[PDB]
Amino acid sequence: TDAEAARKARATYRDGLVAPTSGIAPGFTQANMIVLPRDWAFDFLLYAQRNPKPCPVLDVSDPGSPTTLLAPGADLRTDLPLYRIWRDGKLAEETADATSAWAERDDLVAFLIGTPMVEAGISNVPMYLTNRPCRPAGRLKGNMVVSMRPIPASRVADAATISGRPVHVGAPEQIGISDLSKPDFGDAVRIEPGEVPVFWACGVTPQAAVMASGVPFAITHAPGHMFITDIPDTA
Amino acid sequence: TDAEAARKARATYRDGLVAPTSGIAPGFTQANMIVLPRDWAFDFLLYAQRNPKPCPVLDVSDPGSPTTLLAPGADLRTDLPLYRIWRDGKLAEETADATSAWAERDDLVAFLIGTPMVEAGISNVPMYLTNRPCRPAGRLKGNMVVSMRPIPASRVADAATISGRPVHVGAPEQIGISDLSKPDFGDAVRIEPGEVPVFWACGVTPQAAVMASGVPFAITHAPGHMFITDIPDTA
Numbered sequence: 001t002d003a004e005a006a007r008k009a010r011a012t013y014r015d016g017l018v019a020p021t022s023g024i025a026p027g028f029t030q031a032n033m034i035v036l037p038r039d040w041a042f043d044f045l046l047y048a049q050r051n052p053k054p055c056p057v058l059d060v061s062d063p064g065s066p067t068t069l070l071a072p073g074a075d076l077r078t079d080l081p082l083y084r085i086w087r088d089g090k091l092a093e094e095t096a097d098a099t100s101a102w103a104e105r106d107d108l109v110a111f112l113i114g115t116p117m118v119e120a121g122i123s124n125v126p127m128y129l130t131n132r133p134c135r136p137a138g139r140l141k142g143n144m145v146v147s148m149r150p151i152p153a154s155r156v157a158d159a160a161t162i163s164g165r166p167v168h169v170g171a172p173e174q175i176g177i178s179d180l181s182k183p184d185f186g187d188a189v190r191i192e193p194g195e196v197p198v199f200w201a202c203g204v205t206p207q208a209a210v211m212a213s214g215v216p217f218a219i220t221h222a223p224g225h226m227f228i229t230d231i232p233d234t235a
Numbered sequence: 236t237d238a239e240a241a242r243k244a245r246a247t248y249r250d251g252l253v254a255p256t257s258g259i260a261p262g263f264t265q266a267n268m269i270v271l272p273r274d275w276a277f278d279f280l281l282y283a284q285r286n287p288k289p290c291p292v293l294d295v296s297d298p299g300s301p302t303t304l305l306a307p308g309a310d311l312r313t314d315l316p317l318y319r320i321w322r323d324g325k326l327a328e329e330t331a332d333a334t335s336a337w338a339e340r341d342d343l344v345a346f347l348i349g350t351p352m353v354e355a356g357i358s359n360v361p362m363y364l365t366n367r368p369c370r371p372a373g374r375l376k377g378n379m380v381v382s383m384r385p386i387p388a389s390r391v392a393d394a395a396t397i398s399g400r401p402v403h404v405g406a407p408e409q410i411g412i413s414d415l416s417k418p419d420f421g422d423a424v425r426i427e428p429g430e431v432p433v434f435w436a437c438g439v440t441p442q443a444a445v446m447a448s449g450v451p452f453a454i455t456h457a458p459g460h461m462f463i464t465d466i467p468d469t470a
Contacts, residue, residue, distance in 0.1 A: 154402070154409065156401070157395045160395025161396060161399040164399065166391070166392035169392055171430070174387075193406070194406045
């Protein structure tokens with residue numbers, strides 16, 4: 001509603017207020033970011049279309065253009081709280097501003113991917129590297145990564161039908177997980193009696209893919225620091 | 236398609252060929268049956284509207300009329316393979332024809348309630364009496380009953396979103412089940428490693444309700460012997 005005040009958080013991020021995006025501008029879609037050199041653009045788009053579950057694209061920028069239709073007037077170089085510049089497979093840094101690195105390469109292409117449940121009555125979410133590979137696309141391949149969210153045994157279904165508008169459920173060993181204790185990405189959560197490991201797909205997989213494939217240069221958001229769009233979680 | 240040949244199975248049941256309805260006329264909706272005296276009609280309808288999940292009504296007959304819009308030209312007195320006449324809370328018999336008992340009371344009202352999954356790649360189903368009560372309605376109350384279907388840990392969600400168009404999942408003790416070994420209704424199934432107890436609501440609950448409430452006279456289908464409608468599982 002009013003559709004604005006999401007443009008107010010982005011505004012605080014230009015000034016340079018690093019911070020998680022959790023709960024902020026609640027109601028408006030929030031996304032992950034992956035920007036690769038043009039010569040890798042086709043491959044990511046293919047990978048994204050071939051693996052819609054773990055790689056749902058909301059918008060792709062025009063080569064070298066840091067803007068998005070998901071939030072007219074924004075700037076992907078400064079509107080996120082924190083970024084991760086990746087060089088030759090590795091992590092080179094973690095700036096609150098990517099203007100500098102965007103200027104490095106001329107034809108850069110960015111992919112925006114990325115509460116109603118809590119309205120029904122239901123750190124960084126523990127994520128695991130599965131044994132379930134994705135469909136390859138050019139130089140891109142790898143197994144999808146998953147996010148574990150402990151759901152009560154009575155709203156798991158209600159978690160399925162509600163979100164529909166989960167990749168795995170229970171049996172963690174069936175996707176190659178022998179202990180929720182050691183997630184593939186730090187953390188660990190308190191999974192109580194009566195709760196159930198519900199797994200999800202997210203922007204880590206597409207990320208882990210480019211990473212493991214030796215992409216020379218890449219820009220991403222820093223975990224927990226997504227790009228808040230002007231799109232209301234209802235379209 | 237052709238929408239007929241479901242009227243061919245019903246036809247075999249008039250002759251008197253008791254037998255399960257499993258797999259028959261696949262593609263066409265199949266239902267449970269509950270027929271109570273008029274003076275209980277209002278209560279069941281209320282109970283049914285107040286508990287849509289465990290009591291989904293597809294059609295209600297006009298008092299004393301054994302027909303249904305769900306299959307023009309059928310006769311609820313002879314078109315099911317086997318029936319259960321219930322007298323004063325108890326089970327009085329199990330005939331293949333209910334014509335006789337329908338003639339007993341003048342204003343009888345029948346409720347029709349009641350594969351695509353197996354198209355995705357996914358005895359009598361084990362059912363349990365929970366600890367989760369339904370919303371009462373007049374002389375009707377009681378806890379919903381559930382059906383357990385062992386679903387692979389990768390199609391549980393896919394079992395939720397597919398059927399949407401489950402009441403509980405996992406944690407059986409959270410709904411008052413301390414051992415899937417002894418179902419509330421005989422049977423028992425082989426729940427393998429990597430599978431997950433997925434619970435469902437069905438016509439037993441509405442049945443168990445009328446039963447435990449002392450309804451003098453009632454007619455039902457016999458487990459596994461439903462009424463096959465002319466409605467295709469796609470409307």
